[PDB]
């Protein structure tokens, strides 16, 4: 993707993380596990929901055909009528298909961006106190227990203390 995170420097997703779209995994002496980041996940949910409703809304005022009969000596205007109805259906078909293609691209990139930004939020907290592993992970120089870990998810990780 454009932002380099999803299927980039983070090779793959987590079957183990079930309660959100993005989040953290920790490993320490007490154990390991996953934690969804509720803020960025909820932002994602709202974005994608609004997008869908936006698409559905734009398209609901759109051409609708009606039947018109013509006789054997009104072929020109019958043909005019056929080419006019087909003309608009092609236009709307094109519009729908393209919108979906384009907005799918943007949706996938949006997710990539949210992950990249979450990775950066944490990197900017840890600074020199953790080794950046190159794969989405951060190895701490100090021992970091469950409360230390929560503080990193908090945003309230006291860098100077460590």
């Amino acid at each position: 993707g454009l932002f380099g995170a999803i299927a980039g420097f983070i090779e793959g997703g987590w079957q183990g993380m079930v309660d959100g779209w993005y989040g953290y995994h920790h490993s320490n002496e007490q154990g390991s596990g996953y934690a969804a980041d509720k803020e960025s996940t909820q932002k994602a949910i709202d974005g994608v929901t609004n997008k869908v409703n936006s698409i559905i809304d734009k398209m609901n005022t759109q051409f609708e055909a009606v039947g018109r009969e013509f006789n054997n000596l009104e072929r020109r205007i019958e043909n005019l009528n056929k080419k006019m109805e087909d003309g608009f259906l092609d236009v709307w078909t094109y519009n729908a298909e393209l919108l979906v293609l384009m907005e799918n691209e943007r949706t996938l990139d949006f997710h990539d961006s949210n992950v990249k930004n979450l990775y950066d939020k944490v990197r900017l907290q840890l600074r020199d106190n953790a080794k950046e592993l190159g794969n989405g992970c951060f190895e701490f120089y100090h021992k970091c227990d469950n409360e230390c870990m929560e503080s990193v998810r908090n945003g309230t990780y006291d860098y100077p203390q460590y």
Partner: protein, 321 residues
């Protein structure tokens, strides 16, 4: 001790297309195209359609005797005519401005039939021998039920001078016709007078039909032809008929009681005993999808027709193996 950033994955096989890549597996997706229907013709908000079955719109309005099922039809939501209905004009001929009339019915939900010129009231002309073997009913010769084929009485066709006045509140659909016999002998036999006419007048209408007498091919065994005409009689306006032969007079006309949304749908289907909020010529649609790809001509609260086979939005993210 370490902490990692990451993202969801699951067992989803749902795929979406993009501009740069096709068939990208994603964790979540939303189909927005309706591809299924019930295959039936249904009531539209509980209001049953008029299903003409084997009758055409002309056979219905003129009263083709094979179309007695539609002698008094209630209000309809839409009309369903076949592509080539067998019971059209039993007696061969034409229907003037037929397509402009059908277009009028797309805006009509209800007719009330009323008698404007009683059959009994033709005292100087014969009004019960106007019957043809081309229009049979229960084995006997008959004719279009809403019009009267007047012929000479005791070898005389005195000039007809009749007039109906639209006193009732509605607009009125009045229908009449002219007979085009095969030859001069048939003309004299039926109407005596060699040369004839029918003049019809309203506030706007001012016509004068003359029969064209020519040799024709038989159709349902008839050399003659009937040309049918119509007009809408505005309320409080009167229609004047003058004729000395060949006149196909109106007995019944249709009050237009309900305007609004309707359509004439072409379909070989019959009634399905269902209800629906959206109907197509090949079946009804029950869905909250923004789009469908079933058929362009719909009636009701419908999704938007597109010609696609597939429209699927990504909601989730790229799913990893």
């Amino acid at each position: 001790d370490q902490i990692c950033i990451g993202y969801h994955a699951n067992n989803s096989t749902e795929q979406v297309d993009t501009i740069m890549e096709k068939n990208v597996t994603v964790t979540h997706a939303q189909d927005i195209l309706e591809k299924t229907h019930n295959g039936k013709l249904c009531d539209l908000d509980g209001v049953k359609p008029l299903i003409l079955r084997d009758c055409s719109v002309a056979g219905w309005l003129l009263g083709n005797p094979m179309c007695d099922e539609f002698i008094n039809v209630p209000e309809w939501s839409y009309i369903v005519e076949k592509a080539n209905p067998v019971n059209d004009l039993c007696y061969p001929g034409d229907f003037n401005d037929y397509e402009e009339l059908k277009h009028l019915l797309s805006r009509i939900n209800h007719f009330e039939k009323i008698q404007i010129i009683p059959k009994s009231s033709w005292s100087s002309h014969e009004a019960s021998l106007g019957v043809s073997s081309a229009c049979p009913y229960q084995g006997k010769s008959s004719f279009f039920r809403n019009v009267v084929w007047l012929i000479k009485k005791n070898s005389t066709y005195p000039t007809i001078k009749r007039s109906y006045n639209n006193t009732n509140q509605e607009d009125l659909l009045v229908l009449w016709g002219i007979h085009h016999p095969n030859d001069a002998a048939e003309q004299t036999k039926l109407y005596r007078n060699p040369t004839t006419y029918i003049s019809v007048g309203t506030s706007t209408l001012n016509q004068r039909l003359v029969p064209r007498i020519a040799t024709r091919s038989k159709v349902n065994g008839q050399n003659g032809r009937m040309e049918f005409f119509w007009t809408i009689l505005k309320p409080n306006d009167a229609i004047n008929f003058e004729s000395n032969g060949n006149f196909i007079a109106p007995e019944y006309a249709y009050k237009i009681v309900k305007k609004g949304d309707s359509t004439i749908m072409k379909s070989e289907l019959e009634y399905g005993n269902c209800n629906t909020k959206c109907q197509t010529p090949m079946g009804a649609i029950n869905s909250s999808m923004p789009f469908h790809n079933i058929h362009p001509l719909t009636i009701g609260e419908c999704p938007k027709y597109v010609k696609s086979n597939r429209l699927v939005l990504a909601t989730g993210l790229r799913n990893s193996p």
